[PDB]
Amino acid sequence: SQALSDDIGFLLSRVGGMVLGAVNKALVPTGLRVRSYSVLVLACEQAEGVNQRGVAATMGLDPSQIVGLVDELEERGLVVRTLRNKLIAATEEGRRLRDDAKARVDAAHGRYFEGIPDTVVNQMRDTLQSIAFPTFVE
Amino acid sequence: SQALSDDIGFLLSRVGGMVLGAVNKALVPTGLRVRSYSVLVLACEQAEGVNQRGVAATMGLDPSQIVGLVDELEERGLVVRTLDPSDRRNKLIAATEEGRRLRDDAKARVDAAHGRYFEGIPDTVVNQMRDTLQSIAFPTFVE
Ligand SMILES: CC(C)(COP(=O)(O)OP(=O)(O)OC[C@H]1O[C@@H](n2cnc3c(N)ncnc32)[C@H](O)[C@@H]1OP(=O)(O)O)[C@@H](O)C(=O)NCCC(=O)NCCSC(=O)/C=C/c1ccc(O)cc1
Ligand SMILES: CC(C)(COP(=O)(O)OP(=O)(O)OC[C@H]1O[C@@H](n2cnc3c(N)ncnc32)[C@H](O)[C@@H]1OP(=O)(O)O)[C@@H](O)C(=O)NCCC(=O)NCCSC(=O)/C=C/c1ccc(O)cc1
Ligand SMILES: [Cl-]
Ligand SMILES: [Cl-]
Ligand SMILES: [Cl-]
Ligand SMILES: [Mg+2]
Ligand SMILES: [Mg+2]
């Protein structure tokens, strides 16, 4: 089928945007939106700060875009930017808000994947990781 | 897993965004962007045209958001607002000959641009992803 509604690229972009909208809606009480949430999660994965370069690469953004997200998070004392190399270190308050936000984010997920078994989610996860994070550039 | 890179919602938005940016870039020679392209494609799929509400539902948008996309395509002579010959109360967005020719050019670009991401995936994996994403975007009901 050559129909748009059967096209996997269309579908991925459509469901990605549905998830993005739902997660932004769920995040409203936290003051975060998806990109600032993502920087905060990445910072909270480590004790010491995480490499800003690496954050940008993971998120598929230029480092210049991550700068403003770090400023946003620092406005609320959620991360502290430390040192040509730049690292982003989560605070105790950052870690607390990350937990509250993630429960809202999971639920926003739960709503879209209800009735879809974990075996299907696991295969989707692997496939999407192989696209976003390939072993080399073809 | 607590890791962002294991969050299926993150990965959907991450790869969805890769696809969106690649499609806008592939479309630069056509003058279209992802939404105007989608409307043009959906009009071309029908012989007589497609209803605004159908387009909106396929794109997950309110119908009010489709009017300006149709205006853009109409100003370029790529679609025409017409009336369904089988029901004149049914307004249709119909592709023109020039719209069909551009849609063929544009879909060739977008197909090739998608290949970078999807060509290497096993067919059985793609098929399962397709059907799963359809069940999320376009839920079905009782028979
Ligand atoms: C349409 C999207 C996906 C969602 O936009 P949104 O609905 O404005 O959502 P937001 O993330 O801005 O806000 C989320 C929700 O939280 C709400 N919200 C927010 N901030 C607050 C607040 N501070 N207080 C209270 N409430 C709040 C906000 O109003 C909204 O609520 P609701 O309307 O009920 O869903 C938007 O991200 C977007 O346009 N993305 C770019 C891509 C795009 O054009 N998508 C449209 C579908 S067409 C498509 O995907 C085609 C792709 C395609 C791909 C490949 C191809 O080959 C061909 C085509
Ligand atoms: C071409 C895009 C998709 C849109 O840019 P644009 O057309 O030049 O225009 P705008 O900058 O006005 O953006 C249009 C809308 O695209 C929306 N958008 C912005 N990223 C996207 C996108 N990945 N898909 C789908 N619409 C988008 C964005 O929110 C905005 O919505 P709205 O404000 O309602 O009009 C551009 O954002 C782009 O190239 N994105 C690729 C880079 C990217 O998104 N990387 C991932 C960042 S991290 C992230 O998204 C995390 C999400 C997340 C989700 C769930 C979780 O559980 C956890 C995390
Ligand atoms: Cl954005
Ligand atoms: Cl940004
Ligand atoms: Cl219209
Ligand atoms: Mg919006
Ligand atoms: Mg600010």
The DSSP code sequence of A30-74 is GT--HHHHHHHHHHHTSSSPEEHHHHHHHHT--HHHHHHHHHHHH
- Within 6 A (CB) of ligand 1 lie A 7, 9-10, 13-14, 17, 20-21, 24-25, 28; B 19-20, 23, 34-35, 38, 59-60, 110
Q: Please give the Cα distance from B80 to B60 (Å, whole number).
A: 22
Contacts of A76 (CB under 8 A, 6+ apart): A31, A93
- C-alpha A100 – ligand 7 centre gap (Å): 22
CA-based nearest residue to A92, from A78, A110, A75, A82? A78
Beta-bridged to residue A79, according to DSSP, are: A90
Please return the burial class of A40, using the count of CB atoms within 10 Å of its CB with bins 0-12, 13-18 and 19+: buried
Q: Which amino acid is at B78?
A: L
Domain A1-138 grouped into CATH 3.40.50.150: no
Q: Please give the Cα distance from B58 to A14 (Å, whole number).
A: 9
For residue B6, the surrounding DSSP H or E stretch is: none
The alpha carbon torsion through A77, A103, A106, A111 (nearest 10 deg) reads -130
Experimental technique behind these coordinates = X-ray
Provide, as residue numbers in chain B, all residues whose Cβ is less than 8 Å from the Cβ of A132. Answer: 5, 11, 14-15, 18
Cβ separation B58–A138 shorter than 8 A: no
Among protein residues, the one whose CA lies closest to atom 28 of ligand 1: A25
User: CB–CB of A60/A132 below 8 Å?
Assistant: yes
Q: Please give the Cα distance from B15 to A130 (Å, whole number).
A: 10
Contacts of A45 (CB under 8 A, 6+ apart): B2, B3, B4
Q: Please give the Cα distance from A106 to B74 (Å, whole number).
A: 42
For the B1-143 domain, the top CATH level (class) is mainly alpha
Question: Measured between alpha carbons, how far is residue B93 from residues A38, B23, B32, B43 in Å?
Answer: 40, 23, 17, 6
Cβ separation A109–B16 shorter than 8 A: no
B131 is in an annotated binding site: yes
Q: Which residue from A34, A58, A112 has its CB within 8 A of the most atoms of ligand 2, so it is best to mutate?
A: A34
CA-based nearest residue to A93, from A108, A75, A66, A107? A75
Q: State the alpha helices, DSSP H only, in chain B.
A: 8-27, 34-44, 52-59, 67-75, 97-118, 123-137
Sheet holding A79-82, edge to edge: A50-51, A87-90, A79-82
- B59 to chain A: closest CA residue: A14
Q: Between A52-59 and A34-44, two packed helices, what is the crossing angle to 10 degrees?
A: 130
Sign of the CA dihedral with B87 first, then B93, B97, and B101 last: negative
User: CB–CB of B50/B43 below 8 Å?
Assistant: yes
Cβ separation B13–A34 shorter than 8 A: yes
CA-based R_g, chain A, Å: 17
Contacts of A81 (CB under 8 A, 6+ apart): A49, A52, A70, A74, A87, A88, A89
Backbone angles phi, psi at A80, to 5 degrees: -125, 130
Cβ separation A8–B130 shorter than 8 A: yes
Provide, as residue numbers in chain B, all residues whose Cβ is less than 8 Å from the Cβ of A16. Answer: 12-17, 19-20
Residue B9 token pair: 């919602």
B105 is in an annotated binding site: no
Q: Between B123-137 and A8-27, two packed helices, what is the crossing angle to 10 degrees?
A: 50
CA-based nearest residue to B20, from A13, A58, A92, A124? A13
- C-alpha A71 – ligand 3 centre gap (Å): 15
Residue A126 token pair: 């692997």
CA-angle at A10, arms to B19 and B25, nearest 5°: 35
- C-alpha B68 – ligand 2 centre gap (Å): 21
The single-letter DSSP state of residue B50 is: B
The single-letter DSSP state of residue A4 is: G
- C-alpha B82 – ligand 5 centre gap (Å): 10
Q: Please give the Cα distance from A112 to A94 (Å, whole number).
A: 27
For residue B140, the surrounding DSSP H or E stretch is: none
